[PDB]
Amino acid sequence: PKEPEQLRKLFIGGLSFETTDESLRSHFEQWGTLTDCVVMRDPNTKRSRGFGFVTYATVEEVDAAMNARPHKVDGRVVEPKRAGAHLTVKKIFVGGIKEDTEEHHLRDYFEQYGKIEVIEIMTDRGSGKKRGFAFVTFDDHDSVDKIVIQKYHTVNGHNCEVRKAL
């Protein structure tokens, strides 16, 4: 049973205008089987629009491609992002953690999504009591993208609500 195709796609921005379906495929096939690979072009001139997309057979292949960044494709460093525009952020809100969840609980869980730079457990301005939510900042947006597409996050026994934070 295959993962939904939307979760297997990478949008690739910043392409060289010389990149073709074939050269984009040859590059990204290093990290998995590509079921689709397209450079977007103008319908009249055929000139590249400077972006395209690739679709891998599995989510683990998407992960492998993202972990191999930076990608230099046909001499230009490109910008891959997983899948209406992408809100590219490095920080998440984590809600539902109650008063007993500590920094190490959040670190031990979230560090497997990406490199953590900041963990902020929110406390009440007046009393110092924990408010039951936190923010985690990573060094890169793909961590957040992987996190927010999961249906569930269980941290310190709590079913958590996790969203992109601006």
Ligand X SMILES: CS(=O)(=O)NCCc1ccccc1
Give burial (CB, 10 Å; 0-12/13-18/19+) of 125.
exposed
141 versus 153: smaller Cβ distance to ligand X: 141
Q: What is the greatest pairwise CA distance in the chain? A: 64
Q: Are 141 and 89 in contact (CB under 8 A)?
A: yes
SS3 109: helix
CB 69, min distance to ligand X, A: 7
CB 72, min distance to ligand X, A: 4
In the complex, which residue's CB is closest to ligand X?
70
51 versus 93: smaller Cβ distance to ligand X: 51
72 versus 104: smaller Cβ distance to ligand X: 72
In angstroms, the CA 109 to CA 164 distance is 17
Binding residues vs ligand X (CB under 6 A): 68, 70-72, 77
CB 78, min distance to ligand X, A: 8
Cα angle 83, 12, 93 (rounded to 5 degrees) comes to: 40
CB 70, min distance to ligand X, A: 4
68 versus 118: smaller Cβ distance to ligand X: 68
